Each structure stands twice: as C-alpha cells, then as structure tokens.
Design an enzyme around this catalytic site. Structure first.
Site, PDB file in Angstrom:
ATOM      1  N   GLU A  52      -5.576  -2.790  12.657  1.00  0.00           N
ATOM      2  CA  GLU A  52      -5.314  -3.652  11.482  1.00  0.00           C
ATOM      3  C   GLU A  52      -6.329  -4.788  11.421  1.00  0.00           C
ATOM      4  OE1 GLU A  52      -3.645  -1.957   9.622  1.00  0.00           O
ATOM      5  OE2 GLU A  52      -2.282  -0.822  10.897  1.00  0.00           O
TER       6      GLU A  52
ATOM      7  N   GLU B 178       0.842  -1.208   0.000  1.00  0.00           N
ATOM      8  CA  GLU B 178       0.000   0.000   0.000  1.00  0.00           C
ATOM      9  C   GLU B 178       0.880   1.262   0.000  1.00  0.00           C
ATOM     10  OE1 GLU B 178      -2.861   0.365   3.168  1.00  0.00           O
ATOM     11  OE2 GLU B 178      -3.885   2.057   2.159  1.00  0.00           O
TER      12      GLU B 178
HETATM   13  N1  LIG Z   1      -3.206   0.836   5.771  1.00  0.00           N
HETATM   14  C1  LIG Z   1      -2.112   1.091   6.768  1.00  0.00           C
HETATM   15  C2  LIG Z   1      -1.215   2.265   6.334  1.00  0.00           C
HETATM   16  C3  LIG Z   1      -0.592   2.130   4.926  1.00  0.00           C
HETATM   17  C4  LIG Z   1       0.489   3.192   4.671  1.00  0.00           C
HETATM   18  C5  LIG Z   1       0.810   3.328   3.176  1.00  0.00           C
HETATM   19  N2  LIG Z   1       1.981   4.221   2.902  1.00  0.00           N
HETATM   20  C6  LIG Z   1      -2.744   1.439   8.103  1.00  0.00           C
HETATM   21  O1  LIG Z   1      -3.808   2.064   8.112  1.00  0.00           O
HETATM   22  O2  LIG Z   1      -2.174   1.158   9.165  1.00  0.00           O
HETATM   23 ZN   LIG Z   2      -5.701   1.868   8.638  1.00  0.00          ZN
END
Ligand SMILES: N[C@@H](CCCC[NH3+])C(=O)O
Ligand SMILES: [Zn+2]
Ligand code: NA
Ligand code: NA
Length: 866
Positions: free
Chosen positions: A294, A117
């Site tokens: 998460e 991501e």
């Molecule tokens: N989806 C992850 C963050 C992803 C960061 C991408 N640079 C979270 O919310 O912990």
């Molecule tokens: Zn998140």
C-alpha cells in the site's frame, strides 16, 4: 448487467477540478453535500452523466441556482444545458448501517469507514466515478463527538470546530489531485500509535496507526514495517513520501486486504495486528508485504494513476513487483521467489485455464471488482519482472524515472508504462506488449542435442498458448528464457557461439527456434527457465538423475527447489494414476535418497531445505493434471508424506531437534530454522502414532509463539492424531474472543481430512466466534472449505456443492464481493470428471436463477455455464 469494453474508452465530456465535501455523519442517515468545480470539454450540447448508486437525492444546484434540467436514470443523474464552466452542488443521503456490501461508506463495528475502489464513490454521492477524472479534495466531517472523536480524511487538517448538541467537525485538504477511488473517510474511537519518519531529503513525516481500543499491543510491527517500506523505496527506487502525515486505520470488516487511499490507508486488521502469541511468522511477513504494497502505491497508483479500469495492472502488477522486491531484499530472496512461483504455477495457472481467463489488461469487464485477480496482480508482476530481466536493474530504474517524469500527476495506461521502459532503455518491447493482450499460459517445449564431434549443444525451443474461452486466437510471445549449463563437476559452462559470449537469457520469440552453443566441452545438464524467467509451463524430458544433480549443484537456490519439484511431479502423477487403480504408493529408493541428502546437507541454507521439504499443495498438484481427481490428489499427498516420514524418520527427528530455538525472534535466520523444524514436524506427525502424538502435543503446550503452536495444531488435525480434539478445544477456549486468531482455527476445521468435515463445518456456522457479517470469518470457514479442501468440497455425493449454494444464496444479497470470491471453486467444473461436472453445473444453474442475482456472480456464472 452490461459488459464494458476497453476499446470503447473515450475522454470524458466533462472534468471536475475541485470538490468540497461535507459529511453530516450518522450511522442511519448521513447527509452528503458535494460542491464540484466542473469544466466542459465535449460538445456544447452534451449532458453531464454522473454515476450514483443507492443515493437519495435532496437537491441539485448549478452556480447556486436550483436546477430543473436533470433526470435520474438507472445508476445515473443526467444534467442538461450546462455552461462551459460551473459550480455543481449535490446534496444526497446515504445509510452506512444498511451497507452490508462494504462498498462506499459503511460501518465496521462502531467505526464508520469507506472503501471506494473501484467504483464505490458513486455509492457516496453523484460523481464522475472514473479514474481519469482527477480533482483536488477538501473534506469537512461533522459528527457526534463522543461516538466519533476521530474524524479522518486524506491529507492535512486545515480546520476544526465544535457545535451545539455534542457535535464537532474537522476539515481536511489533500493538495494532490486524485481520482475518487482514492478518497477515504474514517470516523470512530481508536487507540493511536504515533511515530515519525524523516525522509532522505529531511521531510519529517508523522506516522499514525489507528486501531480499535485495546489493540495497541498489536501495532508496533506494522509501524516498523511502514518505516522499513519508506526507507526501502528511498534506497531501491529513489522515491520519498510526499505529504506531512501518513495514516493507517485497521478495520475488522473489509472485503479485501488493504487500500492505498492517499495519506489515509485503510487496512483489513489481518494485515496490521500482530504479537508473538497471536501471529505466525507468515502473518508477520504478510503484514510486512501488505504494508509495503500500500505504501508503494503512493507512487505506482497515486502519483501516477490509471486512465481506466482496464489498466488496473499498470498499478497492481508494478506494485506487486515492488512488494516482492521489498520482501526479497529484506528477507530471503530464494524463499520469496519460491513462494511466488508456487502461487503462479498452482493458483494463477488454474485461473488462466478457467472460464474467467483474461489478459493482464482485460478487454471486457461486467463487474470490475471481479478483476482484482491472481492474473492482474501476480501474473502482472511476472510481466514487470520480465521487463526487469530484459532490461537489467539500471535500465529498469531509468524506465521508472522516465515513467514518473512523463506521467506524474496524471492517469496513464499500461502502454504508457511499456513505452517509458522501451524509450529509457532502447530495448525493443513491441513484441513484448503482446503479454498485455493475450490470456492463457504459454507452454514452452525444449529438446536438446549434444554433438561430441563439434562440442556444440543445441536447444530446440518451441512455444504455444492453447486457446482460452475468452480468445480463439493466440500468437507467439517474447519469452525471456534463462538457462545455465553444468559440466560433470557441477561447474557452469560459459555460454558462447562463434568466439563471442552469448547472453544466458535467450529471446524465445518464435513458434520454434534453435539456439546453438559452441565450446561445450562436456555433455551439459541444463538448468532451464532459471528463476522462473517467464510465466510459462516447461516441457522438457528430464531424467531423475539430471534433477537430483541440479538439487546438489545448481548455483541458484531457486533452481535446486525447482528441480525437486520436477522430480516430485513425475511421482505425484504416477501415484495419482495408481490411486485410481486401487494401488498403493510406489516411489523409487533413489527419490527418497535425494530428500535424505537435503536433510543431512550441512551446507544448505535451512530456508531452502525447508521449502524442498514442503510438498506441493493440493492446488499445485492439481495443475499437473488435465482432469483433476481431488480425492486421489489428497490421498496421494498424505501417502507420500507417510512414506517419507517412515523412510526418513531418524533424519527428520535429528533435524527437528537440531533446529530448536529457545528465543523467539522475527528475524530471517530464525524464521528459516523454524520453518525447517516445522517442515520436519509435519512429516513426523505422519510417522509412528505414539511418537507423533507426544511430539505434537508437547510442541503445542511448550510453544512460546503462535508459529510453533499452530504448526503443532495443524499437524494434529492433518494426521488425525489422538490429541487433536483436546488441542482444538484448548485453542477455542483460549482464543474464542479473538477473531483473527480464530480464523486460523476455522481454516484447520475447514481443511480437515476427517470423514465428517462438512458436518463439522456446517455446525461451526453457529460457533461463538463465527459470523456471516464478517468477510474474514466467512473466508476462513466457508472459503477455506470450498477452495482449500477440494477433496471434501468435491465429495462424490455432491454435498460440498449444495453447501456452497446455500452459503452463496445468503451472500449474493449480503455481500456480493465475498460471494464472488467464494464461487470460484464452482466455476472450475470443466477440470473435473463428467459426474462432478453435472452436479456443479446444476449448482451453477440454481444460482443463475436467484432473485436479485448480483452482477458479481452473474459474470462468473454465465462464463462457467457457456
Ligand atoms: N488497491 C487495493 C485493492 C482494491 C480492491 C478493490 N475491490 C490493493 O491493491 O490492495
Ligand atoms: Zn495494490
Ligand atoms: Na534478501
Ligand atoms: Na536430448
């Protein structure tokens, strides 16, 4: 670097339905084979445009035919003349060892791991790297068995084998279609903590926590928190885990906090590893939050994902809301709310008043990694919470249920979510939607009148959002504005008009409006914007006595804390002005008395007392001012601490002693008492020097846990006590081998009030425990200096800016994401005086001229210099 725009979204010309990956793993040269089943949806003459970055293409086949109709262009592989349905095979090479950016497949110590991501999968293979393309993944991993005994990917193991020359392989299958940002791969040697969770309906889930060899002693709290998360999502949201295994891998090298990859979360070790001598109460509660966060993405992010990256808040705002509700349900709701408000009013408001300001649903993005922000996350959650406030829990849960019913197994939009809430509840959210499209912080101004002839109380409420650099046009929002009215006894006056009760959440929807309440039998003291009911700046002409009354009488603990903040704000502003005039602190006796009363109140929750006795941070204080004087703010914070320490000396010591605990427990009642004890210690450190030095050194040496040890160490640094250097050396000698523990020490060094702090920080770049290769170390030393020591960062000689430029010159090439985190303090230049602005502008111009300037920095620099 080219900007992308939300309004340009179009459905993809091609879909991929299934992808079968093979990795021939090696740190120097990994060979990726990707076999994708594709379907054309667009025009028959439309080519396939695959994203790819830093890939060495080996071959392209379509239905096993070597393909001649393709070309590579900047960031892409463009494939022409395709059938409507076909099998695409790409073979390419990548180099994990060369990946210092930590995006894609990279090395973390001896392990190989991924971060995909937002757009990292295109650093692994040529793909439709956009989250509205969902595909069923199969992943075969081949590697040296000695170096990489554990080979992990999303889902379940479906195959395994051994090969010649000491290699082995494992194949994984994940039955849920996913966008590629949720792909994960991990290879390495780990200790593994294994447990189980049985869902409400009886699904047995294997839980597996992978940590570096030797770290098993630091794993049980994270495991406990995972089980707590699973149970809570069942109880509160009615959501169960949907797979057979749940893996978490703790890695030392990681740009962010953690990542919700389906069935295989990858975590920064900072949000996993804890034991009582290495981790503080705050660390324990952060591990709880991030583990939960998460986990909560499994539904809000994975089962329903994002159509495009402009919809990021759809998963982040909602998942942050969920993590806050989780923490608040299990722990102290008041303390959680207070801390989340501190973050909003200080840090997020600053962002909304900066060149980087954006709506929670951005309209324009150059580098998507720049948009994992306080706004998208924390303001995003405030917007979800406003929906909750407008709907109530029951209707909110009906909206959640309709959201999943409609969108399960798909990529959705922010608007889809609002529509589900609106349709399930029958509450009109059309005006409310403007919160998604408008940036900046609304200012809500309240005037009141009490009419004794008619026993009516009138609130005249106005709103306006100042223009922001990104938006010249602003309109009124739908602001849920919660109120309470108190009589002279501190009793709540029923809200009513014309013989009918009135809801205490006022709908402030216009630029100006009036609310009239009847049968108001006594001139009220109002509590306004209760529980921070909307993310706005409140302007109301409080008297000191109204505020101290609220500190005594307000029903919700949040209001009592908030009243104290309003009281302090007046005197922080007074004393910053005085500082600028060379005058010492001035504080009315009755203000000190209000805090004395808090210390001596036997009925008050220690958790609440502790927060009232925790002064606003220098960042919170900064947002009280149009132009920030960071030196005045730092020195006034210290002077206020010293004045309260002197006036309340006896009471502070009494409460410090009364809250001593011989047993250490990570339990909320114990945490509250300890937070109060250490809040008292903070003031005591700034009292009479000899007593302070004895108290602090004694606590450091006698502490049976890191919370109390660090509180003492921090106080020694903050108050520049005689024992400081000895204690700091003792901590280094004990803990230098442990990076996470040393992060706390680097933070103390970086945020020191000492005159020579920059000299010390520069020298620490050579410290045995520091390395530029590790994001956590960088953030704890350099980030903390620039972001959390604004008085030193903004030294009048400009030395702070020059230091940051030197560091960013390195990081721009090494790790642009960390560089972009670290440049943030420099882009706030317009909040500072003219002399500082010109030095900051000069620093930004130097960075703008870097060879190979990253898009990450380019986006921020260009906005800052505009
Ligand atoms: N989806 C992850 C963050 C992803 C960061 C991408 N640079 C979270 O919310 O912990
Ligand atoms: Zn998140
Ligand atoms: Na609670
Ligand atoms: Na008034």
């Amino acid at each position: 670097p080219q900007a992308k725009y939300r309004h340009d979204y179009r459905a993809p010309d091609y879909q991929i339905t299934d992808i079968d990956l093979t990795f021939d793993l090696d740190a120097q040269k990994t060979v990726v084979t990707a076999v994708s089943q594709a379907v054309r949806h667009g025009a028959s003459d439309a080519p396939l445009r695959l994203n790819g970055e830093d890939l060495k293409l080996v071959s392209v086949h379509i239905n096993d035919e070597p393909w001649t109709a393709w070309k590579e262009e900047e960031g892409a592989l463009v494939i022409s003349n395709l059938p409507e349905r076909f099998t695409l095979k790409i073979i390419n090479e990548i180099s994990p060892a060369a990946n210092t950016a930590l995006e894609g497949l990279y090395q973390s110590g001896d392990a190989l791991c991924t971060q995909c991501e937002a757009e990292g999968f295109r650093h692994i293979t040529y793909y439709l790297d956009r989250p509205d393309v969902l595909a069923r993944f199969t992943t075969k991993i081949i590697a040296d068995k000695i170096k990489y005994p554990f080979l992990l990917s999303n889902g379940n193991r479906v195959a395994q084998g051994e090969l010649e020359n000491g290699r082995h392989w494992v194949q994984w299958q994940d039955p849920f279609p996913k966008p590629c940002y949720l792909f994960a791969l991990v290879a390495g040697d780990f200790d593994v903590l294994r447990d189980t969770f049985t869902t409400r309906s009886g699904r047995e889930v294997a839980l597996e926590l992978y940590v570096d060899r030797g770290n098993l002693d630091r794993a049980p709290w994270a495991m406990t928190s995972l089980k707590n998360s699973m149970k809570w999502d069942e109880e509160r949201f009615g959501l169960e885990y949907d797979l057979d295994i749940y893996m978490i891998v703790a890695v030392d090298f990681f740009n962010m906090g953690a990542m919700e990859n389906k069935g295989l979360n990858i975590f920064n070790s900072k949000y996993v590893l804890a034991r009582t001598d290495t981790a503080t109460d705050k660390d324990y509660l952060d591990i709880e939050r991030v583990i939960g966060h998460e986990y909560f993405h499994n539904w809000t992010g994975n089962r329903v994902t994002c159509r495009d990256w402009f919809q990021l808040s759809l998963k982040e705002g909602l998942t942050v809301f969920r993590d806050q509700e989780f923490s608040s349900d299990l722990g102290s709701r008041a303390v959680n709310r207070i801390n989340n408000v501190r973050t909003m009013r200080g840090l997020q408001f600053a962002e909304d008043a900066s060149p980087m300001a954006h709506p929670i649903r951005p309209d324009m993005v150059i580098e998507m990694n720049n948009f994992y922000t306080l706004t998208v996350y924390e303001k995003g959650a405030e917007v979800i919470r406003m929906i909750h406030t407008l709907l109530g829990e029951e209707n909110f849960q009906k909206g959640m249920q309709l959201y999943f019913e409609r969108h399960d197994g798909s990529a959705a939009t922010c608007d889809d979510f609002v529509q589900a809430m609106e349709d399930a509840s029958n509450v009109d959210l059309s005006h409310f939607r403007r919160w998604y499209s408008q940036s900046g912080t609304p200012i809500v101004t309240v005037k009141d009148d009490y009419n004794p002839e008619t026993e009516q109380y009138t609130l005249t409420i106005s709103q306006r959002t100042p223009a922001t650099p990104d938006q010249a046009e602003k309109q009124p929002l739908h602001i849920p504005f919660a109120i309470e009215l108190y009589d002279n006894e501190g009793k709540v006056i029923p809200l009513q008009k014309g013989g009918h009760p009135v809801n205490s959440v006022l709908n402030v929807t216009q630029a100006e409006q009036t609310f009239v309440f009847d049968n108001v039998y006594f001139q009220p003291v109002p509590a306004l914007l209760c529980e921070f009911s909307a993310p706005v700046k409140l302007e109301y002409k409080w008297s000191d006595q109204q505020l101290t009354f609220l500190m005594r009488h307000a029903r919700n603990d949040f209001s009592r804390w908030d009243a104290a903040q309003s009281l302090l704000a007046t005197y922080i502003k007074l004393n910053v002005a005085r500082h600028q005039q060379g005058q010492p602190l001035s504080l009315p006796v009755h203000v000190a008395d209000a805090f004395r009363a808090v210390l001596l109140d036997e009925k008050i929750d220690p958790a609440l007392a502790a927060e009232i006795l925790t002064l606003p941070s220098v960042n919170e204080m900064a947002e009280l001012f149009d132009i920030i004087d960071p030196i005045a703010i730092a020195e006034v914070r210290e002077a206020l601490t010293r004045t309260l320490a002197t006036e309340l000396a006896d009471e502070l010591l009494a409460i410090y002693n009364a809250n001593y605990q011989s047993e250490y427990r990570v339990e909320h009642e114990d945490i509250a008492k300890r937070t109060l004890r250490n809040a008292c210690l903070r003031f005591l450190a700034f009292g009479e020097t000899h007593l302070a030095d004895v108290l602090v050194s004694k606590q450091f040496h006698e502490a049976n846990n890191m919370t109390d040890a660090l509180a003492a160490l921090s106080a020694a640094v903050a108050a520049q006590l005689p024992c400081r250097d000895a204690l700091m050396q003792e901590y280094d000698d004990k803990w230098h081998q442990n990076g996470l523990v040393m992060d706390k020490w680097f933070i103390l060094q970086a945020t020191s009030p000492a005159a020579n702090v920059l000299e010390t920080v520069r020298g620490l770049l050579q410290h045995r425990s520091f390395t530029m290769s590790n994001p956590n170390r960088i953030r704890s030393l350099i980030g903390a200096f620039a972001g959390s020591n604004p008085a030193a960062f903004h030294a009048e000689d400009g030395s702070g800016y020059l230091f940051l430029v030197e560091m960013l010159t390195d990081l721009n090439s090494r790790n642009p994401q960390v560089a972009s985190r670290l440049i943030e303090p420099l882009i706030r230049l317009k909040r500072y005086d003219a002399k500082r602005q010109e030095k900051m502008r000069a620093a930004l111009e130097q960075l703008k001229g870097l060879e190979n300037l990253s898009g990450d920095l380019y986006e921020k620099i260009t906005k800052a210099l505009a």
